[PDB]
Amino acid sequence: CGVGFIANLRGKPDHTLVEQALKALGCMEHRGGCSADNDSGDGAGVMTAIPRELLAQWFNTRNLPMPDGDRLGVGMVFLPQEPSAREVARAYVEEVVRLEKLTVLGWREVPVNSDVLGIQAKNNQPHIEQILVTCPEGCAGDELDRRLYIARSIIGKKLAEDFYVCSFSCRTIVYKGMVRSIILGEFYLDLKNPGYTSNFAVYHRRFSTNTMPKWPLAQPMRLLGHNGEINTLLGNINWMAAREKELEVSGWTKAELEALTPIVNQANSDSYNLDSALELLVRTGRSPLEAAMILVPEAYKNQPALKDYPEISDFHDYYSGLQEPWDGPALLVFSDGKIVGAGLDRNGLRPARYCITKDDYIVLGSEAGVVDLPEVDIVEKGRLAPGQMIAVDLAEQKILKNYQIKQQAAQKYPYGEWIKIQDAQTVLQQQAAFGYTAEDVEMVVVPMASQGKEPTFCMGDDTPLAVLSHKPRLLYDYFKQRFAQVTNPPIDPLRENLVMSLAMFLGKRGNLLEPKAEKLRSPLVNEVELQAIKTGQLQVAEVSTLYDLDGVNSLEDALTNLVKTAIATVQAGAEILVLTDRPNGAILTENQSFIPPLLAVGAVHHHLIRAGLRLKASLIVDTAQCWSTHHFACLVGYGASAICPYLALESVRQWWLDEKTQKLMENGRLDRIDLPTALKNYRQSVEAGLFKILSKMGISLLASYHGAQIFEAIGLGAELVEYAFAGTTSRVGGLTIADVAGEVMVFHGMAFPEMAKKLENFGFVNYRPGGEYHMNSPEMSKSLHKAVAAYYDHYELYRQYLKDRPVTALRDLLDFNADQPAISLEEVESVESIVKRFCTGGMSLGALSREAHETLAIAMNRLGAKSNSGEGGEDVVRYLTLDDVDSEGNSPTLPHLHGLQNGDTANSAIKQIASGRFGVTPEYLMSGKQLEIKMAQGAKPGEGGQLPGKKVSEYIAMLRRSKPGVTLISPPPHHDIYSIEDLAQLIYDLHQINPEAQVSVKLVAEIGIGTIAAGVAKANADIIQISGHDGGTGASPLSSIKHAGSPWELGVTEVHRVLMENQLRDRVLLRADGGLKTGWDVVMAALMGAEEYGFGSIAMIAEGCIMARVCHTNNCPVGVATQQERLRQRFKGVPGQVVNFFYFIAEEVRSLLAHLGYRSLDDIIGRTDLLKVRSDVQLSKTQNLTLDCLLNLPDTKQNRQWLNHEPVHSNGPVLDDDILADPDIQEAINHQTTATKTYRLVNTDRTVGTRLSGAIAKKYGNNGFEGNITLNFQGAAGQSFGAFNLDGMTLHLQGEANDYVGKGMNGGEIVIVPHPQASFAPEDNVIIGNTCLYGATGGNLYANGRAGERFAVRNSVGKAVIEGAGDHCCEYMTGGVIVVLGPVGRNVGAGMTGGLAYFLDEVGDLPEKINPEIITLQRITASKGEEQLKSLITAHVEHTGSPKGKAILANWSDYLGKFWQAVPPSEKDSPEANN
Ligand SMILES: Cc1cc2nc3c(=O)[nH]c(=O)nc-3n(C[C@H](O)[C@H](O)[C@H](O)COP(=O)(O)O)c2cc1C
């Protein structure tokens, strides 16, 4: 989406504003989307004041007296086209308008020209009429909208695609619909009528993830246009929905409030819902500015900028207990008629640039150079930093964030005023019966307790799904975590922790509406906290989560009465219910079992809701059965306001308190551990885990996580889900209440009747002869390897292991149902032809040894398939095919490989672009036939790459241009992609730099990937890849291997279907990967939708992985996942070996095509009707599972056109295309040429320079060119200006640019300068946006002004001079020099690990802002640092004239005093931070 507003304070209404607003919609076109058509828009809209002039002619013609501004009031209605029905609908608007004591003066048909609509939109166009109304009583402004508010909500109860009120106010009106941005005025002709004038305009361009536009959904709503995604929707809705019967306000009637009956609704969009909510707040007596503050609170904790504003710290301090944030990215632009303003979500995940004139004319929007003011007369150019608002008020004043927020600081105050005022070893078998296992405590609780970090581990979740395994499992194991993908970003929980909180409010929430003067640091509560609170505000009935046998026969009953107990107790005034499995202190064999803490808090939390009661109490789960990081999150997830993990906590006591342990602590295990530390660590480790899981979905506050239900259940049947966990997706639908009962019986059996010695071990984490199955295991994989090494008896073996396999994945429930005769193997397409569909999967050169990695690439290339460079860059040297191979099978060019033919090439066909952009370099991008944007990997969806430091050798450091010692945790988001349009910006960046290369986007299965993919398809991707929760890593958290992600059978299926229904399926080829290792696997993914197939772990095995599962360790015994030379030298493994493995897999495929009866894999894809559910299988835990979700897909028998994709998607005609057209291909092919060119840039010119840079790079690579092209530019520059810029490529921007300047900058220079015609302070004025120098690898950028957030985010080696910046300066920085000549936001440190930064922060306050976790703040001491500073501070002035540059240069000796140098330890001892 594109949003913005325009306001005129110092004029009376004109048409030009409207003209300007329309224009700007136009300049937002790329931030929006189209439909099957490529013609109809995902929607465009504009909010203005009532064009009271234009409506003139209406009254005139009817000889009717026009009412006062304040007393007219206008509905824009959408009505059915069919005449009888239009009148049914008209008579109703009027009927209900009549029902408040208002009169109708009639109706204006709205002149429109349907002829410009695209076909889908036209087909679908409601009939549009404005109704004019008045109050005979003499109602006006506040009372009249307030009335019209009640009114549109009533009309809303009958809302349809055909029948919808856009707006109904005496102050504001909305013209919107399903048009492409510039068409908006062609359609509605009023907007081109000069009689249309407004003091403002809120405009919005929509981007939808579908193809099928519905007019009410276009969007400025009644109050706000909203660009972003609510990422805690289901929560926020659920809480509001519970406020709804108990709404109480200032005189507002219990009948009028009941009239907004349901003000919030699951079915509607995050925007409809937000607008609606925002409305309630406003109409009930707050100003849109304040309502937005309540609902999308700033991040106030730790904010240097709040020093002298303690009022507002108390505003959110207060509201924080009442209203949890509507989280996710968001630029909110809204109007009242009375006020127009904009404000950002807390993290500021959407750009907002604004401009002010001498006349206090203001323009805000997602992009800079958009409305075309006269530069000579601009007075500010700024931007909203995270949380900030800016408004305008009818009484002629602009209103910057500080007033603003104080203005609701000032009133209702009590703020800080009222806030102030507010033994044996039974342990061994409790453990056994609450379902702990040897691995749970040894491998999970213990590490948390000893090291204070949940455990790392490696490779992927090898084992069957809770519901399909035969081993007992927890109810928790059935919930997989959901995470953010293209549609919103994860946030960085370590580097950006300062924005989160695990606070949790214990009292009942009051009236949100009525600010009356009338808390838990973390969700985790220790025996102390527990009792403290059983003192507290109120008494707190325990409810026996427990229940005795026979009598109360069933868990069903116990559930029932729990709920009833719970309901009754809350009625009886109970304000907290501690749901204990430890009721009165004990847990017996005859206290025969429990209610699982999860199934309990769920039931209470929904049944309370169903009861009207949830706002009344808040809930503590007091449980043995919770210890896991995931466990807590499932609890806070389905309702727990907090958790006392009593028996977990105990297992730290029993562990520490034990000879074995104390002994090893006396020598061995770090005995830096009094029990107070084990304990403080156990929990501190749970906190890091809740942070992590939240950020996987980009959520800041546990407060938001809490309602929401950020999981996807897999294996729970419908009634169970409805009953306990209402509105969670469970598409496979398994378990019953009894079904779950039986399972808790399985581990109740074994602590009581049985013998309590040591808890059993099911090799869940790690292959064991006794225990849970594993698709891969060391013995199985040694025989596979020996098979391939030959060219037989092993596959009998290997194939055997494969047989004794139980049910594991969902594909295992399914068999085939050929619809044709079997066929001759000789008919079937060749092995060589299947192999082209195979892919080896982008495993990081870091993670694997180069022997292992280069091998896969040679082998993949041989097969005419492709291999993939994961996220660690590729060594240039591979880019060349090999001559040097000799008789022996070695090559001087790669002396460490073996068995190389003279035809070989180790260059990766796919080159990855991942969050850290480690090797991401112009030649890099040009070296690949395809480009992969890695949104997530299967082992760890909401998270970044990890590579522990052990593994970062000098080689790797050189490749990634990061520092040798140092661990690399890449950022969870691409700082580059905060929304789908953002995705579309990067796809376009890449199409731009190397037009020839198909761009894939790699997504992980989860409910919702379908919709996301529709977007990815609209965003111009060439390939989508679905990756199951299944797949491998060489380092991830154990929790995430085990608890984040969904089966790729759901991933592939859902994408394939949604893409088909949207008619986008042809736009994209699908890859799947996730524990595929078998011809059958391949065939099943083809039936399911996939056209290409990816192999990580088996390709590894085939080269000699055993399955040590020690990948994070750097010990692979086998030379595969280590950097250690010693170990690498042990790498047996030859391209031939994997070449063979894939032929095996192909041959295996051919024969399936034969049983089946088709010649070619091309014939089978998505032929889902060929699948049936298996006769054999029955599981231990449920009768069966519904598989509608994999069986029911678009019939593919005859429509197979979708299987034809264009060869590569185009960015279309681009300014570079021309740059590269004139006497320029001489300055290139004649290697040393000076060229100059100047052009005017408008902000649809995006990624300018980039293509020329690819073009140079494709022939000279990164540094072969000693020419010099100077490109000078004029105007406002769109996204990604001067991306991937190269040496002797100089870029002049006269004006301003937007986000991503110098993204991936490699070399050369980029100078950006105001237009001289300015009478403003460059220093004090924004000239560049967020995320500049993103993965900068070289180059120098110079910028006369302030810059956005994340400046130089993962800067590896680029240098820059700018004059001010937002937050997160230097975020993940790793090298280079960054010089900033003006103030800066907070987190100035985060993860910066190498390179130098110098600031100059005269307010003296810098060190308050700086991220203290790693960097250090020096004053300049080493003369060589001054020399470094000067040289840039000078070159800046040489490149610009920078008034601020010149000032400091002639006062070199003054300002130079305190003015900080940021040193990462790692730079401590260089010539420029010592001596
Ligand atoms: C050792 C190792 C390293 C990996 N590195 C990356 C990575 O760099 N980027 C990425 O997207 N996926 C990475 N993955 C995952 C693969 O790209 C692929 O999605 C996955 O291995 C498929 O799972 P599978 O092993 O079950 O076949 C890695 C997996 C492993 C085995």
Ligand code: F3S
């Ligand atoms: S599991 Fe990993 S540590 Fe080794 S044998 Fe395989 S590469």
